[PDB]
Enzyme design. Structure first.
Site, short mmCIF file in Angstrom:
data_model
loop_
_atom_site.label_atom_id
_atom_site.label_comp_id
_atom_site.label_asym_id
_atom_site.label_seq_id
_atom_site.Cartn_x
_atom_site.Cartn_y
_atom_site.Cartn_z
N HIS A 40 0.75 -1.18 0.18
CA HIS A 40 -0.05 -0.24 0.15
C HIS A 40 1.54 1.16 -0.05
O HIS A 40 0.40 2.39 -0.35
CB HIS A 40 -0.90 0.42 1.42
N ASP A 84 0.61 -7.49 2.29
CA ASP A 84 0.71 -6.13 1.80
C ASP A 84 2.14 -6.13 2.15
O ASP A 84 3.02 -6.02 3.38
CB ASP A 84 -0.48 -5.66 2.95
N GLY A 175 1.65 7.11 8.56
CA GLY A 175 3.12 6.93 8.05
C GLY A 175 4.50 6.33 8.52
O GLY A 175 5.61 6.58 8.21
N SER A 177 4.43 3.58 8.09
CA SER A 177 2.86 2.27 6.73
C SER A 177 4.57 1.83 6.27
O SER A 177 5.79 2.41 5.85
CB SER A 177 2.46 2.97 5.89
N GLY A 178 4.88 0.20 6.83
CA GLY A 178 5.27 -0.40 5.46
C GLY A 178 6.93 -0.69 6.55
O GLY A 178 7.79 -0.75 6.23
C1 LIG Z 1 -4.43 4.09 9.52
O1 LIG Z 1 -2.95 4.55 9.74
C2 LIG Z 1 -3.11 3.39 10.63
C3 LIG Z 1 -1.64 3.57 9.86
C4 LIG Z 1 -0.75 1.96 9.70
C5 LIG Z 1 -0.34 1.66 10.71
C6 LIG Z 1 -1.97 1.64 11.84
C7 LIG Z 1 -1.69 1.11 12.94
N1 LIG Z 1 -2.61 1.88 14.25
C8 LIG Z 1 -2.98 3.21 11.52
#
Ligand SMILES: COc1cccc(CN)c1
Ligand SMILES: [Ca+2]
Length: 223
Positions: A40, A84, A175, A177-178
């Site tokens: 993603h 993912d 942020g 993420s990944g």
């Molecule tokens: C909803 O936004 C997110 C992005 C990455 C990880 C997470 C885990 N709380 C939430």
């Protein structure tokens, strides 16, 4: 990272920042020329930034290297977030040292109860928005499959695991993420999804890296 601590400059040498004019995702360096991130996080025009602490200031240990290719998992479903995971190849090999270093792939899957380290430059508030510029860290246990499934009925696949705290307060966030979840010196997870951040009974959900080691190795070997 919500409810974490300041890691310390270059204390997480495999952590990378993906930059497309701005930081948008984390990743993990797995050898001198490859990064593992979340599917993603896919976009064109990615520069991988290694050796970062403050992502807004050049502090002297960085390596900025453009991506030559990205490979999203063939079975990635963006609706369910199943599979993912994505690989990113660097145009040139990073120069490895104490502050820029690869993290080993898992030989075994980590069990519920294992303590892991989650890191990133994501939001630090569970309701506000505040983005830190230095790398933040969180120590968090892997949760049981049963508790994870009970937290998110109908949404947890065999390629996902929950980590963190059902009481809330401590979690990854936008942020992050990944980015990496590392347990006993191996990359066991990738920051994938959740319902908000640090909310009661909504722990973070992570891509189960041990399910993808064969794919990662074969993909690297031919690309
Ligand atoms: C909803 O936004 C997110 C992005 C990455 C990880 C997470 C885990 N709380 C939430
Ligand atoms: Ca920097």
């Amino acid at each position: 990272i919500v409810g974490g601590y300041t890691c310390g400059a270059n204390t997480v040498p495999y952590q990378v920042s993906l930059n497309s004019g701005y930081h948008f995702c984390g990743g993990s360096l797995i050898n001198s020329q490859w990064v593992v991130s979340a599917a993603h996080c896919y976009k064109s025009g990615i520069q991988v930034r290694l050796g970062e602490d403050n992502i807004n200031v050049v502090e002297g240990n960085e390596q900025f290297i453009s991506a030559s290719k990205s490979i999203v998992h063939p079975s990635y479903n963006s609706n369910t977030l199943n599979n993912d995971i994505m690989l990113i190849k660097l145009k040139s090999a990073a120069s490895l040292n104490s502050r820029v270093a690869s993290i080993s792939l898992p030989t075994s899957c980590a069990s519920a109860g294992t303590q892991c380290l989650i890191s990133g430059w994501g939001n630090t508030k569970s309701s506000g928005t505040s983005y830190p510029d230095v790398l933040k860290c969180l120590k968090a246990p892997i949760l049981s499959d049963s508790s994870c499934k009970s937290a998110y009925p109908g949404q947890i696949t065999s390629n996902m695991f929950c980590a963190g705290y059902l009481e809330g307060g401590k979690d990854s966030c936008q942020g992050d993420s990944g980015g990496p979840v590392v347990c006993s010196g191996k990359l066991q997870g990738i920051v994938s999804w959740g319902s908000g951040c640090a909310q009661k009974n909504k722990p973070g959900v992570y891509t189960k890296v041990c399910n993808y080691v064969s794919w990662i190795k074969q993909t690297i070997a031919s690309n």
